[PDB]
């Protein structure tokens, strides 16, 4: 059940001379198992979670999950 | 990721002004309340599992949502629901210890509404359930600490709503 | 795309310790989700998938 | 089911189903009619299995139906029997599917977490399901009882 | 992914009632056609590359699209086109074996149309090409199995369009 | 083999074999005698399978035996027939094992790279194996030919 | 990793000869014993935790090792010990199902004695514990399957020793 | 310990101990004598706490000491009483140390795994430890009972 | 704040605050009145601290206020004195917070990049803050001046 | 990334034609100006720090933006602002050397609007600042080179706007 | 091109073009006259290079144009010469660019996949391009031939 997510990762830890746009703003497909762990990590990093969609799977399915 | 002290100094920093006597009054009030907050946190932690069990029993159990085709039917979904309530309680006590709602917004409510609607989790039912948690917690921590617990519980309710 | 092919191959070299042309019947990795797509845009996901 | 399992493996391996996997789904197809028959008799004797197996569990566990036990009182014992009925339904699904996938997803992912939140003892739940297995096996023929017993065995092993 | 059996069992599970008599009949029907499904899968597994080659030659070759500026010109784009066709054929055989289009929905069609539009892939050309694949594979497996195969290939066509 | 594949998957997920996998290996065990019989007739007729299939392959792909082709000259033709014999042997191994694991482990891992170093065309190798499949299927009974032909089908699919 | 069938065919593959009649005989013997192997694996899959519990009680409990300072003392160390017994029993059922001890040597007994020496685990006591496991599992699966389980359990003991 | 926890955190931060962390160590040093006296009275009343609290636990949970329960039989009941003595011992260590580090390292980590293998219900273990906390509270002054009660609270919360 | 850091650590390990971490925030709560007093005298004497320290800094290295120095002219000197006031109130925020997190966030990350973009010498900034520390120490009691001095020391180290 | 030569040969490749004499003329023209492009790049590489400093002083400094609450306030924010200006100038010199705007269009401009709007960074102020950079860099490199650079600076301005 | 590749590397390491890199950019631009002259020669003789080299390829590898081969028939042979024409065009582009990234971007990324899908022999395509290189040696002076030869070398090396 891959979740399509859109998120930001502003970082005050350092000022980066190399490219940072790629990591800063991104959309990724995160599987259902990973999403809670990733949600907690990005929320801890303090980035704003702009958007979430259920790219694969169905909103509710008792069995037959991906 | 802020507490009461961080919020006070950051607000003064946004103004650009130095620490004011009114700002220090806010800091004094938080310090005076600090010990009360700490003991409440210990009680919440020790009885956290029981708080969740009692609140779920009084709010969600023996109802249509736990009945088949109700979004908490199936063991996997029931486990996720109780886990989410556990996390709500833990982040609530973090916010209570901080004396600020910043943690709730930064680490809980962000994306929570979007994810819950994406999966169609019943947001009204969750709000009712955490209100049940709120009264159980009020009984355990006491009236004084319960009022502080209440504002952060209601803050989470507002974010879900 | 030039760099993308290099980085895909490099992920093979680190994860499997060698280029995988020996020891695979067919190439069993769809790198298209990582390449010009957001499905495995996270190399943090491509490495994990491998 | 076996078919979806084989397709999942083939999709990961990026290959069409190997002759071995095709052979396995063949055999599942051939025994599908017997699997349906086993499920039919299980649902026919749905109530009998749950009722008498639950009574056997209560006989071996006085603590369960005693004060301080989870299924204490008539209403609580009724809800416990409801859970036993749910597990029987899952077992019939699993027999029809030919694999443990529906049983695992519907009623075994976090079974301990759910029961811990409820306060219910997991080994006692396992004993109840064992009693259900015995009753179902008596109803079934020897060959049929063996097929259904395997799914019951997986459930009790997960309960442990 | 959901098999035909998985979908039927899932519907019964959502109801919470045991397998209905109509549900049993659905399961029996899938078992009846299962052996034919296995045979067809074996056939197009052996001739997968040939099927793709024939379809590409039938519609995608010696045309403006393969000539310069037509999106299939350039070596990398041609390789991407042929592997897309083998992707379509392989997921089509997965769906045929499964007896349901759930695999196509979840693993293929999602984002496929939008990404093709962003890249500039000619969706009409791809739809015609997989139609040519349908003709070739139907000849190889047989009319009865091909008719069953066509519903899933057409499902891919509709999602692309 | 099916047994080792089941054990490998179970070990990867760190759980005992599910009843589905156990039933799978049980049915394979039951049909073992038929599998051995199919392998026995294949090895009994190995010589003619290779010989006449090779002749059909040469007709199908004249460029192979033409000047400049990989199997040009009697010596080169002899070694290609030897390769066909090797793949027949692998197919008998795979049928006995019940899985394509031995075929893959012995003659399909890096098959593309080995042949490109040799200069030999992989699709032409696939055509030769298709001819071997036809001869073997004719020798076998209809039910037996379906299984052995499926193993040949995996080999040609990998060659492609 | 190998099994009986894989070992037989690999032995013939090194020669390059087709399967001769003696090799066929070895394969026939494995097929003859396979049914009881499957039954035994299903039996101890059901009783896995109980087998570990019985063996631990038989030799590892109410002894100095589980008393303070004994190495099974401390809750972590107790969990690690029962985890190792779970490991050994699961790999024993793998080896019994395969009909070959290659799994044990490949995944269990390589670098096991050295790690135990570094950890301070008593190799002798582990050998005793898995001997007790061997008794319990033999009783559950039956006598002849008990002989088969025993050879692989003894193999594990020898590797530890 | 306060010292070990501060030094762990500073080691991860690769810093000489922060002045505030040193201040906490100073205050822990000064309060150590009160901690020692609290631990002293607990170990002096070891016997009364265990027997009184255990009888409270069995009243609260008659199921565990009933036949068909984990502790039924004087010997099994005695070993559970030993477990209660063990946990009181760990709590005395924790009171002296100033952190949970000793408590969690010695026990309370793999607690669910150990007790699942043993068959005991870990919430019932938590109830016994709660009873110990009540008895210890009675034996301590209100200030002292608060300090010891926190460590008991951590133990019961981890059990649940 | 230490409260913030404790919550972060517990959140990382997905645990409620341990009794030791709770005791840490208890101690900081009681320390708050002392910390507020130190910050209050700093803000009461903010003008005096800035002025004489600035004159001392210009006396120390007059190249800053000489022609060719970054702060040559009355407007430039005024803005640098404004920066000194900025850093002093940063230190007041750090003192009440109890840790240096507010100071770092407001005015440290990228310190070299900011002032070298401006063309200002960071060693000269260090001497200016040193003068501020000396004047602040005079206005603080010796026991109190240790606490404020630590934040000043961190700031000058970060300036370098 | 694309350049003048790459653009010319890419256009010929889309045409499917070998290099025409007109295409060779375009390449000759780029070669003719490549000499001036190199020395302009050397000049602003050496003076890059001065250029950013001067532009920041001209428009960004002594304003409410760098005063408290203006989003450029805070040392981290100031460092990020000058870092972005360094990025823009470095990418501008890359585009000037190449003779093509592809690097700006792909590496820089895409997504920059979304990130700036999300963070609250004032795009109008950034456009004003890089306009000031354009004036300063034109003075340093010279008039002809300033014409070459200014188009790429304006390209970035339009992307931000 | 050399300019774009230098810019790419400098972009990755976040550095303005180094003085030596600037020298290389300047040098390539200046010698662009010679580059264009070489490309002009090749496009002037596109017809004979392809025609003569393709005939040499057919003679060296008769199997490609034999019956049952990829190039059998005048239609297929016309397409084969068309492919050689495409590769010569890419080589002229690469000479003009001064780098092989245009050649790779257009016609060496996935040649194995495309040609194997077509059935064409990849080593045979490499040998045809070798024939084009040998034909090129006569057309270009020794100093010029070395420059064009390197681009031909990359094409054949990637092909194999
Ligand atoms: C319980 C009151 C209700 C309920 C809940 C339910 N939630 C999910 C799934 C998710 N919940 C979250 C939310 C969070 N993730 C976090 O890390 C945190 C802490 C900051 C929260 C609050 C997420 C990310 C998911 C999806 C992934 C996951 O399961 O973790 C489910 C599962 C749905 C499904 O399986 O398809 C459920 C059932 N359900 C109810 O009926 C209650 C009203
Ligand atoms: C019976 C063998 C054991 C036992 C059980 C017991 N269960 C409950 C309450 C609930 N049980 C469930 C279980 C499920 N929900 C599911 O979706 C599934 C899988 C499909 C299962 C198994 C639920 C949801 C509840 C609560 C709400 C509801 O009824 O829906 C109780 C009552 C709790 C109480 O004591 O108050 C009991 C007693 N009790 C035993 O003694 C057995 C060992
Ligand atoms: C000639 C040296 C060898 C050979 C080749 C051969 N190729 C084809 C068919 C095609 N070749 C291409 C090649 C390219 N497409 C590109 O975009 C590029 C880079 C710019 C190249 C090189 C393509 C696209 C085709 C498909 C047909 C088409 O153009 O539409 C054939 C024809 C195969 C057929 O049956 O149709 C042949 C024969 N054959 C030989 O014998 C030589 C060794
Ligand atoms: C062939 C029929 C036509 C064609 C296709 C073409 N596609 C791409 C790129 C992509 N193709 C896919 C498709 C899939 N990805 C998957 O994981 C699956 C499994 C279900 C499929 C079907 C995707 C996602 C992409 C984008 C990512 C990427 O770039 O690889 C290209 C490449 C475009 C380019 O410019 O490089 C092409 C050419 N082109 C045609 O002309 C045919 C009509
Ligand atoms: C106690 C209130 C409940 C209870 C417990 C019970 N425990 C056992 C057996 C064991 N308990 C332990 C515990 C520990 N080992 C440790 O190292 C630590 C930390 C220092 C602890 C807490 C162990 C090792 C055993 C095994 C026996 C042994 O020590 O050798 C039993 C006996 C189980 C049996 O039937 O054999 C019981 C009954 N029982 C209850 O009813 C209470 C709720
Ligand atoms: C139980 C019978 C005896 C015992 C065991 C004990 N073992 C460990 C630690 C480890 N054991 C292993 C062994 C394995 N790892 C594996 O993956 C497998 C199967 C492939 C095996 C057999 C390993 C790696 C460890 C260390 C890592 C870990 O903690 O798991 C301990 C812990 C020692 C410690 O203090 O760190 C113990 C106590 N103890 C006994 O008293 C029995 C005789
Ligand atoms: C000071 C002792 C030395 C010195 C400094 C100097 N600074 C400036 C200009 C600025 N300084 C800042 C500093 C900050 N901005 C922040 O947000 C924070 C944290 C809250 C700090 C510390 C800024 C933003 C400026 C720019 C002007 C503005 O504020 O808008 C100058 C003026 C430089 C000029 O020529 O314009 C000077 C001189 N100079 C010295 O000699 C001292 C050693
Ligand atoms: C200066 C003119 C203005 C200004 C800027 C400012 N920017 C940021 C943060 C970011 N800027 C970028 C932009 C880029 N990243 C890149 O890699 C490139 C080159 C391709 C560019 C142009 C990004 C990605 C960020 C966010 C991540 C990061 O920190 O780098 C900030 C910080 C915002 C914050 O508080 O987190 C600021 C202040 N501010 C101004 O006042 C000027 C008008």
Q: How many angstroms separate the CA atoms of J59 and E159, rounded?
A: 53
Q: Which residue of J has its CA nearest to K28?
A: J31
Helix (H, G, I), strand (E, B) or coil at H67: coil
Judged on CB neighbours under 10 Å (0-12, 13-18, 19+), J32 is exposed
Closest CA to D130 of D98, D107, D159: D159
Answer for the pair C34, C41: CB distance below 8 angstroms, yes or no: yes
Q: How many angstroms separate the CA atoms of J103 and F95, rounded?
A: 58
Taking CA H111 as the corner, what is the angle to CA H132 and CA H82, rounded to the nearest 5 degrees? 45
Helix (H, G, I), strand (E, B) or coil at B20: coil
> Which pair of structure tokens corresponds to residue E73?
């010109």
Structural domain boundaries of chain D? 1-160
Widest distance between CA atoms in chain K: 59
**How close is the Cα of F142 to the center of ligand 7, in Å?**
91
Look-up of token digits 């709590």: H91
Q: How many angstroms separate the CA atoms of F10 and F21, rounded?
A: 9
Query: Cα D23 from chain centroid?
Result: 26
Q: How many angstroms separate the CA atoms of C20 and C3, rounded?
A: 19
Q: How many angstroms separate the CA atoms of J117 and J111, rounded?
A: 10
Neighbours of chain H (3+ CB pairs under 8 A): B, D, G, I
Q: Which residue has its alpha carbon closest to ligand 5 atom 7?
A: H80
Q: How many angstroms separate the CA atoms of D22 and D6, rounded?
A: 8
Q: Write out chain C residues lying below 8 Å of E111, CB-based.
A: 37, 39
E67 contacts J15? CB cut-off 8 A = no
Q: How many angstroms separate the CA atoms of K62 and E103, rounded?
A: 47
Helix (H, G, I), strand (E, B) or coil at F13: coil
Would the CA dihedral through K40, K41, K42, K43 be positive or negative? positive
Q: How many angstroms separate the CA atoms of E72 and K114, rounded?
A: 11
Would the CA dihedral through B135, B139, B141, B144 be positive or negative? positive
Other Cβ atoms closer than 10 A to B35: 13
> Which pair of structure tokens corresponds to residue K140?
């270009």
Q: How many angstroms separate the CA atoms of E148 and G97, rounded?
A: 40
Residues written for chain F:
160
Neighbours of chain A (3+ CB pairs under 8 A): B, C, D, E, I, J, K
Q: How many angstroms separate the CA atoms of B108 and B113, rounded?
A: 10
Q: How many angstroms separate the CA atoms of H85 and H132, rounded?
A: 9
Judged on CB neighbours under 10 Å (0-12, 13-18, 19+), D98 is buried
Answer for the pair A28, B88: CB distance below 8 angstroms, yes or no: no
Q: How many angstroms separate the CA atoms of F28 and B139, rounded?
A: 63
Question: Which secondary structure element, helix H or strand E, spans residue G148, and what is its range?
Answer: helix G143-160
Closest CA to A42 of B83, B107, B119, C43: B107
Residue K66 Ramachandran class (φ > 0 left, ψ -120 to 50 alpha, else beta): beta
With a CB cutoff of 8 Å and minimum separation 6, the contacts of E57 are none
Query: Cα G69 from chain centroid?
Result: 28
Q: Which residue has its alpha carbon closest to ligand 4 atom 16?
A: C32
Q: Which residue of F has its CA nearest to E48?
A: F157
Q: How many angstroms separate the CA atoms of F132 and F128, rounded?
A: 6
Integer angstrom CA distances of residue J107 from B69, F77, J11: 49, 56, 21
Q: Does F112 touch chain E (CB under 8 A)?
A: no
Resolution of the solved structure (Å): 3.7
Q: How many angstroms separate the CA atoms of H21 and H2, rounded?
A: 9
Mutate to test the pocket of ligand 2, among D52, D83, D114 (most ligand atoms within 8 A of CB): D83
Closest CA to E97 of E28, E140, E145, E158: E145
> Which pair of structure tokens corresponds to residue G144?
């002849």
Q: Does A27 touch chain B (CB under 8 A)?
A: no
Q: How many angstroms separate the CA atoms of J155 and J107, rounded?
A: 13
Cα separation of the two ends of chain D: 24
Closest CA to G72 of G121, G114, G128: G121
Q: How many angstroms separate the CA atoms of G94 and H27, rounded?
A: 58
Look-up of token digits 């060296």: K60
Would the CA dihedral through G15, G18, G22, G24 be positive or negative? positive
Integer angstrom CA distances of residue H42 from E69, H87, H92, H146: 87, 12, 7, 13
Q: How many angstroms separate the CA atoms of K135 and K148, rounded?
A: 12
Q: Which residue of B has its CA nearest to D117?
A: B53
Q: Which residue has its alpha carbon closest to ligand 2 atom 6?
A: D80
Q: How many angstroms separate the CA atoms of F120 and K64, rounded?
A: 13
**How close is the Cα of A61 to the center of ligand 2, in Å?**
22
**How close is the Cα of K82 to the center of ligand 3, in Å?**
7
Buried b (16+ CB within 10 A) or exposed e, E40-55: bbbbbbbbbbbbbbbb
Q: How many angstroms separate the CA atoms of E42 and I86, rounded?
A: 77
Cα separation of the two ends of chain F: 23
Helices (H), A1-66: 21-24, 32-45
Domains and CATH numbers, chain G: 1-161 (1.10.490.20)
With a CB cutoff of 8 Å and minimum separation 6, the contacts of G62 are none
E49 contacts K114? CB cut-off 8 A = no
- Annotation: CATH topology of H1-160: Globin-like (1.10.490)
Look-up of token digits 């059996």: E5
Answer for the pair G4, G32: CB distance below 8 angstroms, yes or no: no
Closest CA to K120 of E73, E58, F123, E66: F123
Q: Does A52 touch chain C (CB under 8 A)?
A: no
Q: How many angstroms separate the CA atoms of G44 and G37, rounded?
A: 11
Helices then strands (H, E): number in chain I?
A: 8, 0
- Please provide residue D131's backbone torsions phi and psi, each rounded to the nearest 5 degrees: -60, -40
CA dihedral G9, G13, G14, G20 (to 10 degrees): 80
Helix (H, G, I), strand (E, B) or coil at A49: strand
**How close is the Cα of J119 to the center of ligand 8, in Å?**
8
- The reply to whether ligand 7 has any atom less than 6 angstroms from the CB of J62 is yes
Distance (Å) from the alpha carbon of J115 to chain A's nearest alpha carbon: 7
């Amino acid at each position: 059940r891959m979740f399509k997510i859109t998120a930001c990762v502003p970082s005050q830890t350092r000022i980066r001379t190399q490219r940072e746009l790629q990591n800063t703003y991104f959309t990724k497909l995160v599987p259902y198992e990973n999403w809670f762990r990733e949600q907690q990590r990005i929320q801890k990093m303090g980035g704003k979670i702009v958007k979430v969609e259920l790219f694969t799977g169905k909103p509710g399915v008792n069995t037959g999950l991906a | 990721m802020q507490d009461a002290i961080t919020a006070v100094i950051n607000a003064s920093d946004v103004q650009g002004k130095y620490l004011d006597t009114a700002a220090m009054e806010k800091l004094k009030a938080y310090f005076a309340t600090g010990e009360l907050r700490v003991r409440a946190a210990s009680v919440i932690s020790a009885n956290a599992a029981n708080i969740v069990k009692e609140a779920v029993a009084k709010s969600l159990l023996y109802s249509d949502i736990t009945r088949p085709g109700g979004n908490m039917y199936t063991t996997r979904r029931y486990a996720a629901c109780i886990r989410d309530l556990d996390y709500y309680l833990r982040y609530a006590t973090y916010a209570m210890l901080a004396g600020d709602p910043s943690i709730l917004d930064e680490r809980v409510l962000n994306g929570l509404k979007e994810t819950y609607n994406s999966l169609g989790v019943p947001i009204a039912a969750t709000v009712q359930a955490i209100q049940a948690m709120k009264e159980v917690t009020a009984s355990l921590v006491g009236a004084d600490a319960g009022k502080e617990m209440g504002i952060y519980f209601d803050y989470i309710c507002s974010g879900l709503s | 795309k030039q760099n993308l092919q290099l980085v895909i191959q490099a992920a093979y070299r680190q994860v499997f310790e060698r280029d995988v042309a020996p020891y695979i019947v067919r190439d069993e990795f769809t790198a298209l989700e990582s390449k010009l797509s957001n499905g495995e845009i996270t190399l943090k996901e491509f490495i994990e998938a491998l | 089911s076996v078919v979806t399992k084989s397709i999942v493996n083939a999709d990961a391996e990026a290959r069409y189903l190997s002759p071995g996997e095709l052979d396995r789904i063949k055999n599942f197809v051939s025994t599908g009619e017997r699997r349906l028959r086993i499920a039919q008799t299980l649902t026919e004797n749905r109530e009998r299995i749950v009722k008498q197996a639950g009574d056997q569990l209560f006989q071996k566990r006085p603590d369960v139906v005693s004060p301080g036990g989870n299924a204490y009182g008539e209403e609580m014992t009724a809800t416990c029997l409801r859970d036993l009925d749910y597990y029987l339904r899952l077992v019939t699904y699993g027999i029809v599917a030919g694999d443990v996938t529906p049983i695992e997803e519907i009623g075994l992912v976090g079974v301990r977490e759910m029961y811990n939140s409820l306060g219910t003892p997991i080994p006692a739940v396992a004993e109840g399901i064992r009693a259900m297995k015995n009753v179902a096996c008596s109803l079934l023929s020897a060959e049929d009882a063996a097929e259904a017993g395997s799914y019951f065995d997986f459930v009790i092993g997960a309960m442990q």
